[PDB]
Every structure is written in structure tokens, then in C-alpha cells.
């Protein structure tokens, strides 16, 4: 009884990195994949080595396929935090492991030198100010 309980009671990216049973990856040609491909940090560099060797398999075509891989396989998806918030919010069997690996944001893209860019920034700032970005987030993530 004690040997059962002590073992089944004593038991991050590192945990994924220092092992091989659990497959892990990211969306092909996305900023997350690029992050690992260009990371000079040992552990992330170790992980890129893993998912790039098992490339055709570790990397997924899109997030829906990655989420499905997490559901039907022993697989961990390297996904952005607000997307993870949306998923775990709808499947109590799923969870976010560890904290954020980096900090960044989503922005509207425009061709280089577009007159619309600064105007869009001003507009985003307005929507933020009047609390609509919050409302929009709540509407969709519910």
C-alpha cells in the first residue's frame, strides 16, 4: 500500500525536452516553429532538433490538426497562449503546461510603408480605450 501511494503521489518545456516518449511540435511555417528554429537557447534548440528530425510528423499543418493530435495521441502542442486559453476552456481534459516561453502580440500586417498602418494603430488604441477589445475577447472566448 505505501509503495503504491508514495510513487503515485511523489510524481514545462524542459520536461518535454529531456525525454522522447511524448511527441511535441508546432504549426508548420508559423512564428512558433520559427522561434524554435532560430532559438539559440540550449533546451529550445534541443527541442527544435527533435521536432525538425521528426519534422514531417512533429510539425502540424494547422492548429486544428495539432489540437486533434493532442486529443488522439501522446502529443504536446507548442501553441500560443490565447489559443490555448480557448481550447482548454472547452475541453477540461486539456491544459496549458508551464508558463509563457516568450512575450509578444498580434498586429494587423500591411505592406511596408503603407499609410494605413499608423491609422490602424490609432484605431486599435481607440477600441482599446473604449474597452471594445476586452468585450470582443470576452465575446469570442466567452
Amino acid at each position: 500500500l505505501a509503495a503504491f501511494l508514495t510513487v503515485e503521489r511523489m510524481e514545462s518545456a524542459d520536461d518535454l525536452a529531456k525525454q522522447t516518449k511524448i511527441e511535441y511540435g508546432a504549426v508548420r511555417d508559423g512564428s512558433t516553429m520559427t522561434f524554435f528554429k532560430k532559438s539559440k537557447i540550449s533546451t529550445y534548440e534541443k527541442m527544435w532538433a527533435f521536432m525538425s528530425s521528426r519534422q514531417q510528423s512533429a510539425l502540424v499543418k494547422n492548429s486544428d490538426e495539432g489540437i486533434q493530435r493532442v486529443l488522439t495521441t501522446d502529443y504536446a502542442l507548442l501553441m500560443e497562449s490565447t489559443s490555448i486559453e480557448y481550447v482548454t476552456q472547452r475541453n477540461c481534459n486539456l491544459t496549458q503546461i508551464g508558463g509563457l516561453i516568450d512575450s509578444k502580440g498580434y498586429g494587423v500586417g500591411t505592406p511596408i510603408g503603407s499609410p494605413y498602418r499608423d491609422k490602424i494603430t490609432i484605431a486599435i488604441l481607440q477600441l482599446q480605450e473604449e474597452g471594445k477589445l476586452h468585450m470582443m475577447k470576452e465575446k469570442w472566448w466567452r
Binding site: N62, E80, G105, V108
Partner: protein, 129 residues
């Protein structure tokens, strides 16, 4: 050219929006009745685009990025996904959950973030016991 003394040298001689399907930012709206154009899409990013077009006053046509990729630079320096579409002037705006990164800022411009995030990891009695 020419060099004039007190002059110097004269030496020389509506909107298309690309996006991507990603829940809950961009999704195909479900309806019992036929949907055409932009109406086929709904989600956070579409509400944002509607807001931006009211504030800046512009019309727009939503087009999904053809290769369904966000955008990465291949081993020979070439880009794809939405980033490539903006680069080749095939789209005016890319309104989607597109991450603002150093490498991408060298080839396209980004507005200030409308949402922040970070890379993380998505993973998972009785008598008989």
C-alpha cells in the same frame, strides 16, 4: 547629373484583406440560409475588421491566404503565407492572429498589438479499488 552651386546634385540622369481560418479569430459562419462574400466569415478578427473599417471608413474584401500558412522564410530567403501576400502587394491588410516578430518587421509593417500572448504548451473509487 549636374552639380549646381547653391542647389546641389541632380544625379538621376476596395481594400483586400488577407486572413486565415483559426478559431475563434476567423471562422466560417454557420447559417441555414446562403452566405456570400465577407458574410461567410465570423469571429474575433472579423469583428475587429468591421470596427477598423467604421473608424477608418474603408470597404474590404476578405480573402483567405491561398497556401493557408501564416508565413515563414524558406532556406533560400523566400517568404510564404500571409506575409508573402502583403509583400507582393496582393493584399492591403492582413487581419488575423498574426504575430509581430523581428524577422517579419524587416519585410512588412505591423500595427501596434491588439492582443498579447506567448508561446506555451497545450497538453492533457469503490470496492474495486
Amino acid at each position: 547629373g549636374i552639380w549646381n552651386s547653391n542647389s546641389g546634385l541632380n544625379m538621376t540622369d476596395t481594400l483586400i484583406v488577407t486572413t486565415i481560418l483559426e478559431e475563434p479569430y476567423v471562422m466560417y459562419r454557420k447559417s441555414d440560409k446562403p452566405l456570400y462574400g465577407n458574410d461567410r466569415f465570423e469571429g474575433y478578427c472579423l469583428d475587429l475588421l468591421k470596427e477598423l473599417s467604421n473608424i477608418l471608413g474603408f470597404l474590404y474584401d476578405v480573402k483567405l491566404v491561398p497556401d493557408g500558412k501564416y508565413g515563414a522564410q524558406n532556406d533560400k530567403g523566400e517568404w510564404n503565407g500571409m506575409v508573402k501576400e502583403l509583400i507582393d502587394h496582393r493584399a492591403d491588410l492582413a487581419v488575423a492572429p498574426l504575430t509581430i516578430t523581428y524577422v517579419r518587421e524587416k519585410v512588412i509593417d505591423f500595427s501596434k498589438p491588439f492582443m498579447t500572448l506567448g508561446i506555451s504548451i497545450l497538453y492533457r473509487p469503490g470496492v474495486f479499488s
